[PDB]
Symmetry: D4
Subunit: 110 residues, 8 copies
């Protein structure tokens, strides 16, 4: 029920400190996202709450395999630029979770 | 402001299926449902099933230019007897469901 | 004190229905249940079904002058064979349910 | 299963810092609610916990359409008076969520 | 230490029933189950059903002198064909269940 | 399915700051519980975690009716001694909820 | 780094069963399923059922040298008609399920 | 459906302060785990998040009986070395829970 060649989609969901969405999005835009992209490779989407959970961030990344994901994230974590960035969001995120999902055969994101 | 002035709204729909129902669900959606659903709702962004995390989960994402337009589209979907005749094939496969509306960050490739 | 001395108590009842059951539920409640239910419980405040958020959700709200009066009203509701004969038509449509009692803020239009 | 002409009901539910209901209700009454009403238009109800979740606020607003809701909330967020008010509740709210619901045909709130 | 040295352990068992099943459940437990259950488990502390909060909920509480004794008692309960023949009458009325072990505060009347 | 004359049981469940059970139980024992009992009337049980949720308090009170409960709690909240006590637990409790339950006919607590 | 460079990945699978289904589930898994499952997935670490906490719960844990290897193993499991013919015997006993991947601490005996 | 002679497995799950896994694992390794093992007796496994809940610790201990567990934990709690250690993780853990589980007959951990 999925195509032979397909990407894996990681969905990361964060609940932020109440009111922190603007500050979080600013520092990620200005400093974090380009570092993150440079290691992880395919940012799919990056969203914030409007109706539903409030103070929520959802971001989605595509990976050719989970071993490749692991290698890429390890390089990200070892990057001094990322380590310098992290304190700027570490206390804005309260609770976090991730999942890996696969595309249906009819998903436009394959 | 922390989003672009002109942007799409993203609806994320998350279903927990009856245990073991993913293959049956995806089959009948592919063969009998998704073209009808797209023909009303418009821009399907992505359609996923779970591998690590919640098991038996479906997530699908749609983009809309406004929530009033979303509303008009869903009304047409729900009034279409071609869709109402399809729904019985998945509505017992789905146990629990939720949706949310989110906006894209300025740096989201999905704008 | 952060509420008016004389005020009503608000009961908010939230149900998660069987997936896809909202239209059937609302039909039979309208046609066969709500007048009987109101005739015991009294002041219905609002009765809603979900659009964005939890799917398959019903929320209904009732106002009472006291919780002892609420109790007496619900006892009469539950003893009425006209209501007990109605309940089978929704009790399998409802999967999960909860209620809570809340008080109005001083600036609530619902006092 | 709803009337052709009807309002949309937004239900906002907040879990506050333990013990914060009195302080929250005071500052909302004294400063926030009139600003909020002036932009949003139809406050329906505004409630706090008694039996159930403790430290909870539930407030309900009616809107003629979700596009109208969006316009109104944007004006609220741009109001310097609201921006000055927000710090007074931003740290009293811990967790928050909202939903949009529609009235049944037999709802007294239509 | 924040409890008395000699104290009982309290097991709190919480069930969510099938919607509307409380009256049927309580009837058959009263008539056919609770005496057998007590005869193995010992000291029933309290047995409650919900009014405001979660709906369709049962909470029952048992006291034990030790958790090894609890274990031996539950093993005997589960081995008794009189109990295994009773269980079918409630096991489909119960949807979801959990238990926890708690200790009494020094100022708890239940010691 | 309950006896005509019966009490109502309020079950209050608190999740505390991690590690706070000892400190919480000490100050409640030394200062709070006697004040609380004096207004509320029938403490049934007062428990803390051992296996299950960690950092949890569960306490149970019996009331002849919910209107009587309301009157008693109002007097408790107006007692300067209780108002002086509350700051000593207000920040030890993180999340809280209550429910009202009724006794089965075969409950030893009736 | 807070783990050893060479380590296994641990998958923890948690199921909530139909109330009262643990004995039936464990019987048929023992007799008809676990050897087939092990023959694809490899290193079973532990397989548990609940006593205090969530009731009707199964937790099983598997170790993998890499997530790509896990993926290849699960694909082979799901393609095996011997496993697909076994699944009907548990897939209605399981109500809700989730999995997670965790790494061992440096001081974990499971490395 | 379990073997006559078998161990009980305690599974302890903690959600930490966001970003705290490295610091937590360091202080547990350097100071806490040897004290803990010395009283509790059979550490089975000790894990941290990778995909699923983020900021999560799961640790598993085996006990011959729950009375033995109780005795061992009481000695741990009375150990001045453990009492000196606890402040170093008390505020890194936000939410915690434990459960006791039994091994299936075919579990390699018996």
């Amino acid at each position: 029920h999925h195509h032979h060649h397909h990407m894996f989609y990681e969905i990361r969901t964060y609940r932020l400190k109440n009111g922190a969405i603007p500050a979080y999005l600013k520092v990620v835009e200005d400093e974090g996202i380009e570092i993150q992209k440079s290691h992880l490779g395919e940012l799919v989407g990056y969203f914030f709450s409007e109706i539903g959970p409030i103070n929520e961030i959802v971001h989605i990344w595509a990976f050719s395999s989970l071993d490749d994901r692991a290698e890429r994230r390890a390089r990200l974590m070892a990057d001094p630029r990322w380590l310098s960035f992290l304190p700027k969001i570490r206390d804005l995120i309260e609770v976090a979770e991730n999942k890996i999902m696969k595309p249906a055969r009819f998903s436009p994101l394959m």
